[PDB]
């Protein structure tokens with residue numbers, strides 16, 4: 001799962017807990033305010049709103065098979 | 071695997 005909380009560490013709640021295996025890396029698209037993550041099990045890059053809504057998946061990346069950080 | 075080395 002990928003969890004969100006207040007910067008205080010309270011209000012901890014999952015926001016992405018479906019179709020996930022090894023979500024190694026996280027990133028924020030500061031321009032669009034969108035959370036990006038990446039899987040090492042399914043080998044996919046995904047991005048969504050900060051609430052975990054509007055989930056999208058990027059196209060296949062040729063030789064990416066164990067992405068750690070992004 | 072996925073462990074840190």
Ligand SMILES: *[C@@H]1O[C@H](CO)[C@@H](O[C@@H]2O[C@H](CO)[C@@H](O)[C@H](O[C@@H]3O[C@H](CO[C@H]4O[C@H](CO)[C@@H](O)[C@H](O)[C@@H]4O)[C@@H](O)[C@H](O[C@H]4O[C@H](CO)[C@@H](O)[C@H](O)[C@@H]4O)[C@@H]3O)[C@H]2NC(C)=O)[C@H](O)[C@H]1NC(C)=O
Nearest residue numbers: 001002003004011012013014015016017018019051052053
């Ligand atoms: C996986 O991740 C999902 C989220 O993507 C989690 O589901 C959410 O669990 C949360 C628990 O903290 C809840 O916020 C939320 O469930 C409810 O949300 C309701 C919001 O009200 C609107 O939406 C409902 C949708 O069914 C609709 O029926 C209603 O008319 C409104 O339009 C709340 O009302 C509801 O409150 C109930 O539960 C709380 C306890 O949690 C009680 O205190 C209340 O009295 C009441 O009985 C509740 O908050 C969940 N959202 C979704 C998408 O279902 C999963 O929990 C995660 N699971 C795992 C395995 O990690």
Ligand SMILES: [Ca+2]
Nearest residue numbers: 040041065066
């Ligand atoms: Ca793999």
